[PDB]
Amino acid sequence: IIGGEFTTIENQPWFAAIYRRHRGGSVTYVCGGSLISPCWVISATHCFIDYPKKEDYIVYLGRSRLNSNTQGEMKFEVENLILHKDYSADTLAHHNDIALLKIRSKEGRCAQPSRTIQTIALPSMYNDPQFGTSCEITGFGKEQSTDYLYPEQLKMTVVKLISHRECQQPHYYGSEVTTKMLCAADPQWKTDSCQGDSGGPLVCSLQGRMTLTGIVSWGRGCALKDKPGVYTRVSHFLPWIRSHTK
């Protein structure tokens, strides 16, 4: 998250922090995700495609910090890691960039709601806010493109939805962006998602309800003029989600 502000998990209680254990036993951060029901985290497929084995992953819920534990967090394994079969990539512009992780604790349980762990509603099909609407994004991604480190403290920012006609201009993303994607950016290009924010929530308020509108997916650089962040458009994948979670 370029710009925006620091936050804690209470302000985004559905945010999931996804890590992977390496051979040798080191644990490194992977991507964010969003809890959509007690046993199901939703994220991006590109976070996982290179290491598609469920056993390698650890999911935390209720966690506000990257490398230290937050009081009341829940730690899970991945019982199943569900990648979208139609996924495709290039050169940046990932298609069908959506994944389901079914979570289970060592004790065999799913998420238990608390002040720091709640679920987020999916939108109704083909229902998204009008362009220009302001929405929030959350994650542990880079604070500046040149940074090497990721922030220890969770962050959020605000970005505005961009129309497909604006995004599809050659001087934006041309044909890289499809109707199953959403573009969002800051009017001054000063805040944005960045490396490490992938998989996490774009949350918009539609009809009073906080809604999982998008999942961080790709962009060229970050907080670059004419180069918005790109999000998987959740409202075009409800059938895939429902089948895959049933």
Q: Domain coordinates of the chain in residue numbers?
A: 1-12+120-235, 13-119+236-246
* Catalytic residue (one of 43, 46, 64, 235): 46
Q: How far apart are CA 189 and CA 72, in angstroms?
A: 36
Q: How many helices (H) and strands (E) does the chain have?
A: 2, 13
Report helix, strand or coil for 121.
strand
In one-letter notation, the amino acid at residue 17 is A
Q: How far apart are CA 170 and CA 174, in angstroms?
A: 4
Instruction: Return the structure tokens found at 102.
Output: 């079914």
Sign of CA dihedral 232, 236, 237, 242: positive
Place of tokens 């995700």: 33
Q: Which CATH architecture has domain 1-12+120-235?
A: Beta Barrel (2.40)
97 a catalytic residue = yes
192 a catalytic residue = no
* Catalytic residue (one of 56, 97, 128, 197): 97
* Catalytic residue (one of 34, 43, 193, 198): 198
Q: How far apart are CA 235 and CA 150, in angstroms?
A: 30
Q: How was this structure determined?
A: X-ray
CATH topology of domain 13-119+236-246: Thrombin, subunit H (2.40.10)
Instruction: Single out the residue of 201, 142, 146 nearest to residue 3, CA to CA.
Output: 142
198 a catalytic residue = yes
Q: Would 1-12+120-235 and 13-119+236-246 be classified into the same CATH topology?
A: yes
Q: How far apart are CA 13 and CA 62, in angstroms?
A: 6
Instruction: Give the CA distances from residue 132 to residues 28, 160, 166, 229, in Å, rounded to whole numbers and listed in that order.
Output: 36, 5, 11, 14
Place of tokens 């999931």: 16
**Resolution of this structure in Å:** 1.4
The four Cα atoms 193, 12, 119, 79 give a dihedral, to 10 degrees, of 60
